[PDB]
Structure 1
Amino acid sequence: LSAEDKAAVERSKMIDRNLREDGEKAAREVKLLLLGAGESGKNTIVKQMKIGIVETHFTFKDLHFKMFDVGAQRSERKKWIHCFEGVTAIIFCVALSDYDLVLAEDEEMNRMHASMKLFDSICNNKWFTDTSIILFLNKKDLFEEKIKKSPLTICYPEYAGSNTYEEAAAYIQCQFEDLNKRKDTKEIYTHFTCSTDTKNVQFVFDAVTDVIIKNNLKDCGLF
């Protein structure tokens, strides 16, 4: 082996060392996929987490998150959805103050029905069979102020319940957690977000920590 070849092997070993260090660094970060409707309050939640694709790094209690967002990607989701098979969790927003509205100029489509359809598609996808979901049900104050004048019968014909923030919110929540047909592999963490909530980072921290511990226990065959 010539001296030049020895120099080449030296350089290759340096490159391998650098790549190993970078991979070990990248393996310890939480990767989140932020999904939701355009007007579902994604921007406010993004703002209160951090104190084509848009990336937002943020740290909480000595742990790191990257939090990818794909809202501005108007194309077929089946083509690029498999790029997110190995993410830690999926965050999904609903915007409860949408049960008496219409979208996409269809003029016969409840916004919340479209949200349920999207949730059903994402939850029962082939690439996401063991990925937990954090469901934020936000704009609850508008729901509280609105529920008096308009009942839930516009969005749900069968309600058999009272018009109060105590029972309608729970009714909407039990609708979304009943579309999950994989109850023995994943779970849904539901939280009610609002303006100046300031307590959503900790909820995400708790959910992701539980997810990590459960994954590690399942790998050991200990769960």
Structure 2
Amino acid sequence: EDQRNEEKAQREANKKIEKQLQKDKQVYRATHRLLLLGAGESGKSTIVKQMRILHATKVQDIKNNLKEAIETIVAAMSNPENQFRVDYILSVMNVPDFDFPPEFYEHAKALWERACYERSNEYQLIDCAQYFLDQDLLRCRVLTSGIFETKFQVDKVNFHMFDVGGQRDERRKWIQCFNDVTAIIFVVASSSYNMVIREDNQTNRLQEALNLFKSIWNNRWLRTISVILFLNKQDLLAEKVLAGKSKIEDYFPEFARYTTPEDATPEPGEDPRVTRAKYFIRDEFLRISTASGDGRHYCYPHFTCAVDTENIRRVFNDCRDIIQRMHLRQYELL
């Protein structure tokens, strides 16, 4: 009686609720999710900004980065004009409050007028500083904790690309969650073969990237997820190879026995030297990929410049292949 009335409302609500989940189920299966793993100072956040192109508070922040850059270079000097400004920079070296005043800003340009920037390997600083000392939104670097998610729509499909950020992340345990992702977009730095990591001796920054790649490649949970590889910072590699300093063979002795691949599509107008290096970096990366996988893993290398090159089509083109190979293997047609 009254109880019968009590049952009736709940059944309708279950009926109403269950209708709503049916509508949302179709949207969930129509979205392909990508995880933007990488390494520190690799330009991964530049890609996200270029992806928000599909679909003034920071200006105050840019100055703070500039202040950090001046302090690091001045401290690096210890390793006479405006000596008082140099003392003033030491005086203003650690003011936790804001540092609004013009005289330090004027003094800073004068102090630069030196060779410390040339010895990049000896200390640790920010890459963005050279542009700041002498797109603008993406140039600045900010460290923030949290997941940045960007949803963009192309050719009647939906892609949800998100980057996870850890300032001191190590022995990652949240990687177990990402089991159903379509692909992992791995970003590396190709101009870090002659730089140290964190100012701790560490190793060549790349050697850290390769060690990170090995851990990602061989994992129980990530045993069925393909990897898309981006070799960022192509512009800086060409300049360093042209420059006499920072010889590649010294830091990596295995380059001496390496030879150019039989197969190549060297870009137009490229000296047989810049190019030679490029392949080595790639192969070094693939060597790990071919060792294991047993047909459930694949690596798609690429050569990109984050600032200028457009890369929206490359991800879409390769993503159609990843799904196709999975369906071929399941049906044993492959």
- How far does the alpha carbon of each residue in 1:76-129 deviate from its partner, in whole angstroms, 9 at most, with x for none? 554211110110000011110100000122124110000111111111111111
Q: How does 1:24-39 map to 2 (within 5 A)?
A: 24-39=26-41
SS at match of 2:296: coil
Q: How does 1:67-82 map to 2 (within 5 A)?
A: 67-72=161-166, 74-75=168-169, 77-82=171-176
Question: Gaps spanning 5+ residues in structure 2: where?
Answer: 54-145, 260-271
Contact in 2 for aligned 1:58/1:66 (Cα 8 Å): yes
1:154 aligns with 2:264: no
User: Which structure features the higher share of helix residues?
Assistant: 2
Question: In structure 1, which of residues 8, 23, 31 is the aligned counterpart of residue 25 of structure 2?
Answer: 23
Take 2:281 and 2:147, find their aligned partners in 1: how far apart are those partners?
A: 30
Give the % identical residues: 44
2:288 equivalent in structure 1: 179
Change in Cα spacing, 1:158 to 1:201, as seen in structure 2 (3 Å) is same
2:75 equivalent in structure 1: none
Question: Gaps spanning 5+ residues in structure 1: where?
Answer: none
2:330 equivalent in structure 1: 219
Take 1:105 and 1:138, find their aligned partners in 2: how far apart are those partners?
A: 22
Take 2:34 and 2:182, find their aligned partners in 1: how far apart are those partners?
A: 6
Normalised to the residue count of structure 2, the TM-score between the two structures is: 0.63
1:44 equivalent in structure 2: 46
Pairwise CA RMSD:
1.8
Larger radius of gyration: 2
Take 2:203 and 2:157, find their aligned partners in 1: how far apart are those partners?
A: 41
Structure 1 range deviating more: 170-179 or 141-150:
141-150
Q: Match for 2:308: what amino acid?
A: T
Contact in 2 for aligned 1:96/1:139 (Cα 8 Å): yes
Contact in 2 for aligned 1:99/1:154 (Cα 8 Å): no
Shift of 1:201: 1.0
Take 2:12 and 2:32, find their aligned partners in 1: how far apart are those partners?
A: 34
The total of aligned residue pairs comes to: 222
Shift of 1:5: 0.6
1:107 aligns with 2:201: yes
SS at match of 1:221: coil
Ranges of 4+ aligned residues in structure 1 off by more than 6 Å: none
- How far does the alpha carbon of each residue in 1:34-76 deviate from its partner, in whole angstroms, 9 at most, with x for none? 0111210112111222322111111222211111211236445
Take 1:207 and 1:19, find their aligned partners in 2: how far apart are those partners?
A: 31
Structure 1 range deviating more: 67-76 or 113-122:
67-76
